[PDB]
């Protein structure tokens, strides 16, 4: 159970979500700072 | 008769001929019919040719065991070198077919005619009031046939080293070339592939951009092609919409909006690239080959640290060491 390679998988699955996160965070934010019509 | 010859010249030069037999044509039409007719017969029925001058005939015709892919018209003998070998130079045809006579009759007439073909691509443009230069685009592919069929042989000292007239025979020309000149590692060949790759690339770019920005004039169930009539006044596509899309793909200033500048580039690129490729073969015809980085990177003690350049040399040695099995009697390959 929860072998070294299993831990690494999480590390990458977690390190991945973060990147998606900060990315959509930053994006969703700056998007909502200008776009007038 | 306004004067026979006066008339003749009016016909020849006539711009009302289905096919414009020009002044250059008067030389072209015959030379090209000889080249073509001799080839077709050769390729189908010619017998084995002692290409390497070592009495080891290479049969390359259909009736003698070849298929379209393997078959070819074999180069004149090496015993002959650069000497002129017209049929009237042989005790018999049997002798002429054995020393690869057909090869010369073909390359010479072809190269001759293919040049006039260029001379013609000018003439007709003149008789029609259009700007010249198209013939200059055709100078690239021609300058290649020349490099591969004549310059290389002159340079190397024999017509037997010219590119064979056949599919596999060509691969032979390539594989060996690489071994003796390491062409892949030569600037000119690289420029060549840039032009060819690029050409095909751009050919696709233009082709798509244009075709994709065509003004609608056709039904939902009607060939989008009919939306064009031969002899139209205005354009058939929105070159402004085209540029609009392409400018956004990359970025505006990196996109054409001037159809004339677009089309010049479109022609300039491949022609310029192939010009260099032709100059490559014409240059390596005097043994100024590609970069030789064999054993360049060496370590602190002097050991040789290989690079991909070396893995390439091994593959080249294999070719060197095996081509022309029985033709060499000495250490260095100076021919």
């Amino acid at each position: 159970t929860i072998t070294p390679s299993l831990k690494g998988f999480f590390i990458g699955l977690l390190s991945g979500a973060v990147v998606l996160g900060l990315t959509f965070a930053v994006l969703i934010a700056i998007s909502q700072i200008d776009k007038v019509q | 008769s306004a004067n026979l010859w006066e008339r003749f010249c009016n016909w020849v030069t006539s711009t009302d001929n289905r096919l414009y037999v020009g002044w250059f044509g008067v030389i072209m039409i015959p030379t090209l019919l000889a080249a073509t007719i001799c080839f077709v017969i050769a390729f189908i029925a010619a017998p084995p040719v002692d290409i390497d001058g070592i009495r080891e005939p290479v049969s390359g015709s259909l009736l003698y065991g070849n298929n379209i892919i393997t078959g070819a018209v074999v180069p004149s003998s090496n015993a002959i070198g650069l000497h002129f070998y017209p049929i009237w130079e042989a005790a018999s045809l049997d002798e002429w077919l054995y020393n690869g006579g057909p090869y010369q009759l073909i390359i010479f007439h072809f190269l001759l005619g293919a040049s006039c073909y260029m001379g013609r691509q000018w003439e007709l443009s003149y008789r029609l009031g259009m700007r010249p230069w198209i013939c200059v685009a055709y100078s690239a592919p021609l300058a290649s046939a020349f490099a591969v069929f004549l310059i290389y042989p002159i340079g190397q000292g024999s017509f037997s080293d010219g590119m064979p007239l056949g599919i596999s025979g060509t691969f032979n020309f390539m594989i060996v070339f690489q071994a003796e000149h390491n062409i892949l590692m030569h600037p000119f060949h690289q420029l060549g592939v840039a032009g060819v790759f690029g050409g095909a690339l751009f050919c696709a770019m233009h082709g798509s951009l244009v075709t994709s920005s065509l003004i609608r004039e056709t039904t939902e169930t009607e060939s989008a092609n009919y939306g064009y009539k031969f002899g139209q006044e205005e354009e058939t596509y929105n070159i402004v919409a085209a540029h609009g899309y392409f400018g956004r793909l990359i970025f505006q200033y990196a996109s054409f909006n001037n159809s004339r500048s677009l089309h010049f580039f479109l022609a300039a690129w491949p022609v310029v690239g192939v010009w260099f490729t032709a100059l490559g073969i014409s240059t390596m015809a005097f043994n100024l080959n590609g970069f030789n980085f064999n054993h360049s990177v060496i370590d602190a003690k002097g050991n040789v640290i290989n690079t991909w350049a070396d893995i390439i040399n091994r593959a080249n040695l294999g070719m060197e060491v095996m081509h022309e099995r029985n033709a060499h009697n000495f250490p260095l390959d100076l021919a």
Binding site: - | L19, I44, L62, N67, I68, K229, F230, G231
Partner: protein, 32 residues
Amino acid sequence: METITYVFIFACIIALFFFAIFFREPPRITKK
């Protein structure tokens, strides 16, 4: 048998050539 097949197709392409050059649909202007 193979030779015949190769020459035949070739002979067929040359025939095509002929018809294509000399029996195309005359290319008509404006009113097409």
